[PDB]
């Protein structure tokens, strides 16, 4: 020198990112999905469907996952690590995508400001900052 409105979650926004669902080493992966998160726990997911009519239709979800989400990040292979003041939990989008939101803890404490380094040398190794300041 216009701006487009997509969904409008009613509660504030915390994390926006992307995943590679159906993951059946390189840094930049061609991400199949799109994810955002709320604070009070509203999660959003988008996918390309091209089902039931023979034309491309946007498949949206909207989950209401527990606890006030304080932070989240993405892991290689359609996984998302998010954090609530009780526990650090994880979500698997790899399976159209997922009807109900199933999530285990990782038995780590309330970590705010998570971040991941993908090793792919063993296993995946993330860096967290615990709410106690460690």
């Amino acid at each position: 020198t216009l701006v487009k409105i997509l969904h409008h979650l009613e509660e504030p926004v915390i994390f926006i990112g992307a995943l590679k669902t159906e993951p059946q080493p390189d840094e930049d992966v061609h991400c199949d999905c799109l994810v955002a998160f709320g604070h009070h726990g509203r999660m959003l997911a988008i996918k390309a469907s091209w089902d039931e009519s023979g034309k491309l239709v946007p498949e949206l979800r909207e989950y209401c996952l527990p606890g006030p989400v304080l932070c989240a990040a993405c892991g290689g292979g359609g996984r998302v690590y998010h954090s609530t003041p009780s526990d650090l939990c994880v979500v698997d989008l790899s399976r159209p995508e997922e009807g109900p939101g199933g999530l285990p803890p990782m038995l780590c404490p309330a970590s705010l400001n998570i971040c991941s380094v993908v090793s792919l040398s063993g296993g995946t190794k993330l860096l967290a900052l615990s709410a106690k300041g460690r």
């Binding site: 409008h8 949206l60 009807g99």
Partner: protein, 296 residues
């Protein structure tokens, strides 16, 4: 009714006007036990060719895939009441399409009743429960001392309809399920079939323990057909009719052509000597008149 003074109230009780001139309506609309926020603004005249239709995002998400449809219905449809009937039909159809999306389990009916029923059963029987609490795997014992497992996939309203049972044992498991029925009933039927086959279980356990069974490796109890190896480059696939386990199981040979012909001819000659009292190995060793190799 014919007129839209009471017909609109009977067909959309939860949508109520704000203005004297009935132009601004706001409120809910109900389809499949869910009230969805909504408002709709006609101009001064009851024309729908240009009529604002504002919604909630929770509703726009669902109507994704029919926005052009509902737009066309607004400009085509004569009356508000007819249009709202069309809109309720479309919301219902779209949710029935996205029925994997909206369902869930009742908190005071499902997570309450299922655990009380598992307590009725016994905590030693449950081996596996999913995080989603959909899959539960149950264990059952025989009088001989074998474990047999059953998968159960539970629906949202579990005792309302039949739960999906995936049981191993080879017969078609006929599970009489009433609404009053629960896990103990299907487990009593599970033990009933397990004990009706305490005979078949002896046969297939003998074939597993004594003989070299080839490619039901770590055989599930579903396998009606057991591939017993005899000799070299030759095998017999015995399909046990589990209703009559001691009865002759339909069987043929696989391998080379020049060795299997004598085996088949000798089976055809000694078929009449099959007694239904002895073990299947005892019958086969005297019919085919040869000893079987044990883990060659």
């Amino acid at each position: 009714m014919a007129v839209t003074e009471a017909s609109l109230l009977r067909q959309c009780p939860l949508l109520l006007p704000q203005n004297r001139s009935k132009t601004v309506y706001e409120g809910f609309i109900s389809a499949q036990g869910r009230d969805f926020h909504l408002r709709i603004v006609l101009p001064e005249d009851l024309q729908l060719k240009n009529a604002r239709l504002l919604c909630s995002w929770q509703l726009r998400t669902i109507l994704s895939g029919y926005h052009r449809i509902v737009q066309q219905r607004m400009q085509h449809s004569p009356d508000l009441m007819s249009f709202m009937m069309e809109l309720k039909m479309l919301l219902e159809v779209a949710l029935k399409n996205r029925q994997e999306l909206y369902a869930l389990p009742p908190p005071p009916q499902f997570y309450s009743s299922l655990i009380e029923e598992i307590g009725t059963l016994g905590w030693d029987k449950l081996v596996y429960a999913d995080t989603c609490f959909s899959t539960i795997k149950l264990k059952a014992e025989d009088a001989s001392g074998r474990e047999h497992l059953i998968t159960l996939k539970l629906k949202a309203k579990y005792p309302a309809e039949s739960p999906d049972y995936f049981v191993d044992f080879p017969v078609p498991f006929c599970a009489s399920w009433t609404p009053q029925s629960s896990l103990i009933s299907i487990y009593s039927q599970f033990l009933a079939a397990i004990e009706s086959l305490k005979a078949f279980w002896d046969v297939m356990d003998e074939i597993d323990e004594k003989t070299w069974v080839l490619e039901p490796e770590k055989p599930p109890r579903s396998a009606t057909a057991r591939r017993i190896a005899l000799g070299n480059n030759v095998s017999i696939n015995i399909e046990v009719d589990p209703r009559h386990p001691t009865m002759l199981p339909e069987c043929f040979f696989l391998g080379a052509d020049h060795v299997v012909k004598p085996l088949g001819i000798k089976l055809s000659r000694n078929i009449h000597l099959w007694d239904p009292e002895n073990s299947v190995l005892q019958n086969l060793k005297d019919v085919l008149e040869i000893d079987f190799p044990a883990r060659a």
